[PDB]
């Protein structure tokens, strides 16, 4: 239930109803407690809910928490970070995968800082056809700002010495 590091393992996201929403096949475990496992991916595979594939395009260092409803994705582009934050379930590990449930909601931070809240209508169509109960929806939209709030401070993933120190380890490792 706690990856070790420089382990490869698979991440499985899920939708509330429990059908498989999107599979990565190869992450390298960079850090890995109670609390927190960051890993590293590149050129994975990925596959969708029709079990349709493609490969990663760029190097990422992935975040995930055990106390917060979101995890987050740091792609490294040609013209800087990118960061692409799932509102989730806190993870769950074993011997299959590290797992979540994504719900829908979702952050995109460019390099410049901007960010941007997506897939409102997503979440509203899913939230009433998934029948997602009302504290699960307070803690999402409690994550939310908690999520912008980490942005804006520069906190967790969103600190540039994270992203300088685990791009470096992944960059060392792989
Ligand atoms: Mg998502
Ligand atoms: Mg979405």
Same mark, same amino acid.
């Not at 190869?26 to 590149?42: F, P, R, S, Y």
């Not at 169509?125 to 997602?132: A, D, K, R, V």
């Given at each position: 239930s706690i990856p070790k590091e420089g382990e490869n393992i698979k991440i499985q996201s899920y939708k509330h109803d429990g059908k498989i929403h999107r599979v990565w096949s @190869? #992450?390298? /475990? +960079?850090?890995?407690?109670?609390?927190?496992? /960051?890993?590293?991916?590149?050129h994975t595979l $990925?596959? @969708?809910?029709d079990?349709? #594939?493609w490969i990663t395009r760029e190097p990422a260092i992935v975040y995930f928490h055990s106390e917060y409803?979101?995890? $987050?994705?740091?792609?490294?582009? @040609?013209?800087? /970070?990118?960061?692409?934050?799932?509102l989730s379930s806190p993870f769950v590990c074993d011997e299959?995968? +590290?797992?979540?449930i994504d719900y829908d909601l979702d952050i995109k931070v460019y390099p410049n800082g901007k960010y941007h809240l997506l897939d409102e209508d997503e979440y509203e =169509?899913?939230?009433? =056809?998934?029948?997602?109960p009302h504290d699960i929806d307070i803690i999402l939209?409690?994550?939310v700002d908690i999520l912008q709030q980490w942005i804006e401070q520069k906190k967790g993933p969103f600190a540039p010495?994270? /992203?300088? $120190?685990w791009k470096e380890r992944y960059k060392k490792i792989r």
């Open positions: @190869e #992450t390298t /475990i +960079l850090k890995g407690t109670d609390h927190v496992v /960051i890993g590293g991916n590149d $990925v596959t @969708e809910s079990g349709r #594939t409803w979101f995890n $987050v994705i740091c792609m490294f582009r @040609e013209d800087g /970070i990118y960061y692409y934050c799932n299959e995968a +590290l797992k979540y =169509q899913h939230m009433n =056809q998934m029948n997602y939209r409690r994550n010495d994270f /992203i300088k $120190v």
